[PDB]
Design a protein around this ligand. Structure first.
Ligand code: NAP
Ligand code: NAP
Ligand code: NAP
Ligand code: NAP
Ligand code: YGL
Ligand code: YGL
Ligand code: YGL
Ligand code: YGL
Lengths: 249, 249, 249, 249
């Protein structure tokens, strides 16, 4: 039987690209989404058109709350129900918006930014491990985590927590043969709420080609880490940033 | 007149030593505490006996919840109520216990470990900044954050988030002349819950002196960072670890 | 036309595995060596018997001296002379022995350790760049660089410098399309006549499998980095260490 | 009896400020210099006036060569000959100039940049240890080491090696009671060769006050690390950068 993967926030953009590349590599996939239902089902349709019974969807909010653990357990369970196994978890889904220190309440900002970027990854990691082969987890980190965006403190705190999870879970799950790694983009697919002049501002900062990464380039590094060529790699975070993090102010 | 400082979890151990040193340097202090009411009240009394009405107690659970923002605003408020100003915030309070990936619920563990180590610090930081010469914040970090204790994922995640806050907040509050730094103990005062064979193992690991740091040694770095000798220092985390973090497995 | 690579210290152990693996992917290779002449020529023979005119040797001492720049230029020249091009440079040669702070002179220890691990890589990088598709350089780093072996200060200095080269050259050569990355082993092929006690100690410290990396596992990360699957990756160092670097003392 | 310190490159700028602050703190000082002979004797004169026989000069080139170890030995010996003891070594002297990868020879560039920033510090550290209370060494590092200046690869390699030396020497000298730490400026005293256009560009990048650090501000951090308030601190590098290293491109 083919191995199976859960990719969170996989309806669009980088997660979709990762689910496609995993599917093309031979994986069956759980396409987790929150609001992008049409895009999710549309993607599952297409992957199933290529290989029947190889893709399902799973809806969940990954905001922190007292039921997040049950939601994360259900995501992993949905993979076992569909495919009878769960070999790969990709923690991709991410809330991203400014939260200045000086519409949403602060309680909600905390719950969304810390829940999606860190706590859900942790609970998903727990459920993945408890439900248990080249088993691995890839976390989508941030190459700029030590040179953060102005006024993105909660988002940055989440991404730093995710580095911590990557390290602590690599350490703890190693005896079980589960590898835990990260992929850290710089600028890749640019936010939709961003004008051309802003996009060119960011592009111009990247030493290697003065362009953003394609979603597929981020996916390539994911594919490497889950592959048999990375069987001794755990606790490593691969930057896929074109040198951006190397550039001083 | 004299500056004022909030120290969280200041009733005992390291937070106490920090509150005392700040007080001996001339600060008025808010002694925050959670359960240790006798030790807290007793400490404010000892300090007030030295200098009249230079200390107040303030109780608050710093576990994450929908009331945590109000709680943190009230801690900062209590410093302004008592002293008319708030020059220094020290984020010291911390829950610390194992949370294995494989009698508290996971959601309580998340709330306590991430709340105390990261979320409360962010909220205090926000409140501190909104209420605003040498203003500064000192976050109690962890020298071993990249070599974490087995099965302490949530704690480590919290301490990573706290690095992120330290960096993000230094960047964002610099324009208001608020510095934000960290002090990172290795092993200092050893926990009550730890075994003797484990206690001595830790001491022998320390290159410098094969002993743990005193609470006072930790405090000395806090005093340096809040002083006028640290006026251009922001976004820095000083390890006070006797070389422990340099030691391989 | 097949791409060509220079691998330094390619006669044995990890460098040999890298040469073999690049040759298997379709590269012609220059096998650089210092003293292991028989192994180097035996490797070249084997690779040429596999595909004709795809392997040569180049001998050079990579000790720091006033002739080092010419030696490094000669190494890069030898690829162009045999193959007409040079697409990949792998900086793998390394002196490794203790240099306590308290038979070789210190002058020689500095020359050997800093020369092989840092300055030769830098000179080689300069010669490679100046002579210029998918061009890259991979530097063999050290996952334990921040938790060094006791009394190995010059070696550790060399490997830190090599990080700095990796970053600095990534930044400077990105406009030319030359990527510069690192692979950082923990414990791999265990040095000859290490005791069974010692080896076993090291193995038992590795979280993932309690075993050292095979030279091939180190080579797999090199191959990935040179590949078209790493096209946006520059200035990244990938640890291949089984989680060794995550393990506290 | 007054303790004694060696400060390399102390005739001018930051090393001067450090020697001055050490002397004001009670130390006798060896003012090492290379070309700035008049500045150096002018400083020893100014200090000796305040306190008789408490300052001497010592001329030495700290370029790498086969006699560099003798030169570093003699610097240390100059402290013993003048003061009977040597308690503090500050590695401040530094060559700084671009060395592009694509009229000094490269040999000379390597010797000057690696010698002054790394090898001389190693050899000075060796001699300090071997020639032997509150003994310590402070290395002047660089807060921007992971975000290098374009075309400054050799300078950057040397500063990375100096991080490595700080860590390795901290580990190895801990048992002997010698602490080893760093201070990492961002932008401080602006080079004399620079024009007020370019100076302002640098100043504008600094979040904490849009200004370079003062030499005294750097010196303040050195004084803290040599003091009894840093007695458990070893292997720590304190950034004094005004948040500059936290600012993305
Ligand atoms: N794009 C970049 O340049 C960049 C840079 C650095 C790091 N990264 C990281 O790479 C990963 C992918 O980036 P991206 O730009 O593709 O991400 P994105 O479009 O910003 O987010 C991916 C998905 O996250 C899901 N999500 C958001 N909030 C959620 C919630 N409360 N509960 C459940 N799911 C939620 C959304 O699902 P629905 O659409 O279904 O609602 C969204 O499609 C992220 O972790 C990101 O942080 C990206
Ligand atoms: N000890 C070490 O060697 C070491 C090593 C690494 C890092 N650190 C860090 O340095 C700081 C001080 O260390 P420590 O050993 O002194 O800390 P600790 O004794 O373990 O905790 C200090 C205080 O935190 C408060 N706290 C715990 N949970 C709380 C909650 N839910 N709400 C509010 N307050 C809470 C407690 O207050 P009450 O007693 O009033 O309930 C406690 O006295 C901590 O941030 C710690 O993470 C210490
Ligand atoms: N093995 C591990 O566990 C490990 C751990 C961390 C990092 N690494 C890094 O990974 C790389 C490969 O490791 P390894 O164990 O295979 O290395 P190695 O066998 O110790 O040395 C590789 C080669 O370096 C060459 N060399 C040594 N001194 C030289 C000199 N003065 N001039 C020219 N070449 C010289 C030697 O060539 P000849 O044999 O031809 O004389 C030797 O075969 C190294 O850069 C190492 O530092 C390895
Ligand atoms: N200034 C900054 O903004 C900044 C930024 C980052 C790091 N740092 C570090 O902080 C330290 C001080 O900075 P700075 O600007 O004061 O340094 P600097 O003025 O550039 O150099 C200090 C001294 O180094 C000595 N030196 C240069 N080449 C030498 C050689 N071949 N042999 C012996 N000595 C030599 C010189 O002595 P003579 O004049 O006597 O010849 C010089 O006065 C340096 O280590 C620097 O890298 C400074
Ligand atoms: N979930 C999510 N996370 C993101 N992080 C970044 C980002 C953060 C710091 C530095 C650069 C990019 C981005 C980002 C992507 C392109 C340009 C700017 C920011 C991003 C995003 O679009 N979605
Ligand atoms: N709040 C709180 N945080 C702590 N962190 C540590 C610690 C964590 C990682 C490595 C070493 C010490 C400790 C700790 C203290 C002594 C020995 C081991 C761990 C500690 C603590 O007692 N209280
Ligand atoms: N050239 C060269 N470099 C090496 N570095 C290491 C090493 C260094 C620090 C931590 C672990 C391994 C090693 C090393 C390899 C196995 C066990 C211990 C050290 C090594 C080597 O054999 N050759
Ligand atoms: N010896 C020596 N080292 C230096 N390093 C820097 C520096 C390096 C990287 C980033 C910022 C400053 C500088 C420097 C100082 C001010 C402006 C730009 C660079 C500097 C210097 O003047 N002398």
């Amino acid at each position: 039987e083919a191995p199976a993967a859960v990719v969170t926030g996989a309806a669009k953009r980088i997660g979709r690209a990762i689910a496609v590349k995993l599917h093309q590599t031979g994986y069956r996939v759980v396409i987790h989404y929150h609001n992008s239902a049409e895009a999710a089902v549309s993607l599952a349709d297409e992957l199933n058109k290529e290989r029947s019974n190889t893709a399902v969807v799973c809806q969940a909010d990954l905001t922190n709350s007292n039921v997040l653990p049950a939601s994360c357990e259900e995501i992993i369970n949905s993979c076992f129900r569909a495919f009878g196994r769960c070999d790969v978890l990709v923690n991709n889904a991410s809330a991203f918006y400014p939260t200045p220190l000086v519409g949403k309440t602060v309680e909600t900002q905390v719950a969304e930014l810390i829940g999606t970027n860190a706590i859900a990854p942790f609970l998903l990691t727990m459920s993945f491990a408890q439900r248990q082969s080249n088993l691995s987890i890839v976390n989508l980190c941030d190459a700029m985590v030590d040179q953060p965006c102005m006024a993105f403190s909660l988002y940055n705190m989440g991404k730093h927590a995710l580095v911590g999870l990557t390290q602590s879970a690599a350490l703890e799950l190693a005896p079980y043969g589960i590898r835990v790694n990260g992929v850290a983009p710089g600028v890749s697919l640019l936010p939709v709420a961003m004008g051309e002049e802003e996009k060119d501002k960011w592009r111009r900062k990247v030493p290697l080609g003065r362009r953003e990464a394609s979603a597929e380039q981020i996916a390539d590094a994911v594919i490497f880490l889950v592959s048999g060529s990375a069987q001794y790699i755990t606790g490593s975070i691969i930057k896929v940033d074109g040198g951006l993090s190397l550039v001083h102010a």
